Write a protein that binds this DNA or RNA. Structure first.
Ligand SMILES: [Mg+2]
Lengths: 97, 106, 95, 87, 95, 106, 82, 98
DNA sequence: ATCAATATCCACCTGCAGATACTACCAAAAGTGTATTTGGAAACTGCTCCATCAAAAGGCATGTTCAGCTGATTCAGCTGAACATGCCTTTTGATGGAGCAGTTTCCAAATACACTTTTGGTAGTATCTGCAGGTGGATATTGAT
DNA sequence: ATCAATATCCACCTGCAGATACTACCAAAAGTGTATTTGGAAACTGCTCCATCAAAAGGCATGTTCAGCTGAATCAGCTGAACATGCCTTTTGATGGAGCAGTTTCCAAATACACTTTTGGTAGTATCTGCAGGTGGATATTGAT
């Protein structure tokens, strides 16, 4: 029974997702999260579908960008494993915190 | 009656750019040179992007430019990348880039 | 049914000039529209400020031109400034 | 109206595999197990910020419908300008 | 010779209401002026955009209010809005 | 003749603000209340910062506010700091702060 | 004993900045690294400032020119006008 | 003969310069650098004294900021010694580079 | 631990750089009286948006397995911190003059307004064509041995 | 290296969504042509305030010494990657209903504009003092032993 070694598939996934542009968050769950959060600011709100798509494009672009910076922070620490402290440091230096 | 575009030697609409400068409340008055100059810079920039995207389309064996081709254009050009450095192009993805240490072996 | 206008058509003309056999998807055109509007505002805006800083009430091709040097990076600024200047000069002697 | 289901815990719809895919696009090879909650938290803050501003535009215009333009304007304010949905 | 306007006096009046036996250096006052102008421009700027997004020709207290909500942090925003509402009310009810 | 500032209960020049709005190309027209509102907001914020910088002055055994006092006031408040997060205050220095891992062991 | 202008930003001055920024210990390669950063910062701000100057048909760079340059580089400064 | 251990004066200097607000680069060599640099954009330029000050306030503020971020990067890597890789990483994440 | 060296803190003193106070114009707020302009308040559309129902696959949850990464530990060697001072670079204060800023002038170029013409937007139908997604099947890549 | 499992590549091939193509209406622009207004370039020049420089000032270049930090090397533990397996939830595409964006037509209220008063706010001038440095002496901190 055959096995790729740890990392081999990971790099394959990196090549794959860096090649494409589809959204990586499932559409409906993200739509609920938006609605749930909006609702907490204001009840009886409606959304153009294109508003929810705009939000999802914005969020994914942000998160991927944050992971690049996070990854740099791990590799600075001589690790190859991203950890919360890397996200936290990325966000600090970005002036988000 | 000649359009001002043609007068000025431009594809982009001078008439319309003049109007937008008025309704946008940027100053009390707008000199006749402004829309002409602005329209031409706009046209120059879009020609620059389209030239570079057209090439990405062709590199990926495609006839029709899509957002991925605009992203590859912008992100691969140092000066477009900086001009548009805080802009997100929907459905553009990211450039393939893997940090060297992450690759296998030695 | 109210006229929603856009640059989709000038964009297409210019497309055909640089790449005669190449098309463009409407999402790609969406992006080019965003771009034009974006760079319009940023130039117009720098110009606005720039006139205000100099107690002028008028935006001329000279404000746009500084606006452009302040906004665009090196080589793009140089070329954009030619084409602006060239259009204005040509326009001026076409009446 | 008649009913309207209670929305709760939808942040957990941002699954571990979806977060991994995003990391992959970001060029991440290996991911510690605590990343997923941290990522959910950072995402929630981002959304709240964009939606508060978007809804604020909505309310200002006396609509009950959040438009793509409301979101685009909110994204611009936040210095995350988005192309492809108008404006 | 020509007049050089500044806020440096309203600032001083408020200083006194708030800390009567406390003064302020010239530099500190420069910093307060920069502040007031900054916040002025930010709020006026958002107002402007708001009006334009809604095809209105008028910046009214509503635009300033929404603009405050968008620009200030929570608690500041809240207090500011009430101050700004109190002052309009007091001005309207004043024959 | 009564000043609009005095009518509105304000130290900040309602008239001037009106003028600055008119002649900043922000909009064609300007409502009556707007400059009163705006003036109020600017007064309120001014007071918060003077209050907190006053206390800063007091803490340091002083009666005259200097830039250092404004800096300490602003950077020691979650909200003002955020509002002023991309602003430099000349002659303010920085908050005393030393990363714990840099303190001497024994 | 001729010397470069960038080298006028001396090791001890760079060390003082680092100290104000909370830095305890400093690699010897920092001082050149810092000088290069400083240079890029100043190039960027002055280029814009001077562009203001030229627009205003002046041969004197005013503080307001600098202040506006700083503003549009996202480094708003308070206390020199504006 | 008396001698303070390494890091003791450093801390002392940190406390000192974090309390104060004076500029930390000597005026003249700064002023020359400004002029040198401005020369490549236009010749025969004069500078208001307050203009050069505005510039200095801004650089030092910017650099002190960068050293904070730089220090955090060094600490992130479990060092106490800022290095060029730390300044570069901070600039990268800020979006000044790469 | 004790003990000296040196930094640090605190009280008090004082000259003057830099506030605060005062005066007196006068540009610019406010008051007055028309001359536009606008944002609704009602009163209807045709949408997009919400909800829901069914079928289906496509991706998600979980448990197992162990590769190899992380973090602890040790350590040697290099590399930056600390150190005394006169050489020299910067700071300080004094003096022509460059040029910013004040002011006045006047016409090239701006807005304003009422026509006339043209184009860019959409909507109705029609055709077309690029390429997404499926199919083998020939060519790598990876990991056990 | 050699061999086998399986991912990758590429190129050809049909259905079709999305793109291009008119066609044609037309309403909103954009243009054209006087009449009318004026912003700001031009030119002169007053008077700050900027470059220059002489004497006074005090920070830094230097070379040595070694404390302790960084990076290399080793390794035990366990975390996170890979993958198989069972099936829930998302995707897709209908259908109906309506809640509500988006217009349009009349005015009542509100805001601009031209014209006069009537100050509040500035520059120029005149007093007033907070506190930056100085000293003096006590105490805390650090580092040696
Ligand atoms: Mg809820």
């Amino acid at each position: 029974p055959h096995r790729y070694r740890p990392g081999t598939v990971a790099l394959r996934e990196i090549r794959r997702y860096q090649k494409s542009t589809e959204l990586l968050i499932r559409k409906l769950p993200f739509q609920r999260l938006v609605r749930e959060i909006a609702q907490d600011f204001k009840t009886d709100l409606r959304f153009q579908s294109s508003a929810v798509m705009a939000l999802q494009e914005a969020c994914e672009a942000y998160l991927v960008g944050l992971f690049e910076d996070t990854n740099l922070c791990a590799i600075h620490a001589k690790r190859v494993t991203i950890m919360p402290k890397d996200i936290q440091l990325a966000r600090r230096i970005r002036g988000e915190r | 009656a000649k359009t001002r575009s043609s007068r000025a030697g431009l594809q982009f609409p001078v008439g319309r750019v003049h109007r937008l400068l008025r309704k946008g409340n940027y100053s009390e008055r707008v000199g006749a040179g402004a829309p002409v100059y602005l329209a031409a810079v706009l046209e120059y920039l879009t020609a620059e992007i389209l030239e570079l995207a057209g090439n990405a389309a062709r590199d990926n064996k495609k006839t029709r430019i899509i957002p991925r081709h605009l992203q590859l254009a912008i992100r691969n050009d140092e000066e477009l990348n900086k001009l548009l450095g805080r802009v997100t192009i929907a459905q553009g993805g990211v450039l393939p880039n893997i940090q060297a240490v992450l690759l296998p072996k030695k | 049914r109210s006229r929603k206008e856009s640059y989709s058509i000038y964009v297409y003309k210019v497309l055909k000039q640089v790449h005669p056999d190449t098309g463009i998807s409407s999402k790609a055109m969406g992006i080019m529209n965003s771009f034009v509007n974006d760079i319009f505002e940023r130039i117009a805006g720098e110009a606005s400020r720039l006139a205000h800083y100099n107690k002028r009430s008028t935006i001329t091709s000279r404000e746009i031109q500084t606006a452009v040097r302040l906004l665009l990076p090196g080589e793009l600024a140089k070329h954009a400034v030619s084409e602006g200047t060239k259009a204005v000069t040509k326009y001026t002697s076409a009446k | 109206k008649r009913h309207r289901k209670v929305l709760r815990d939808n942040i957990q719809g941002i699954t571990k595999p979806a977060i991994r895919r995003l990391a992959r696009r970001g060029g991440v090879k290996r991911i510690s197990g605590l990343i997923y909650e941290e990522t959910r938290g950072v995402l929630k803050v981002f959304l709240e910020n964009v939606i508060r501003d978007a809804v604020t535009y909505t309310e200002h215009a006396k609509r009950k419908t959040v438009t793509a333009m409301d979101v685009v304007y909110a994204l611009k304010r936040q210095g995350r300008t988005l192309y492809g949905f108008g404006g």
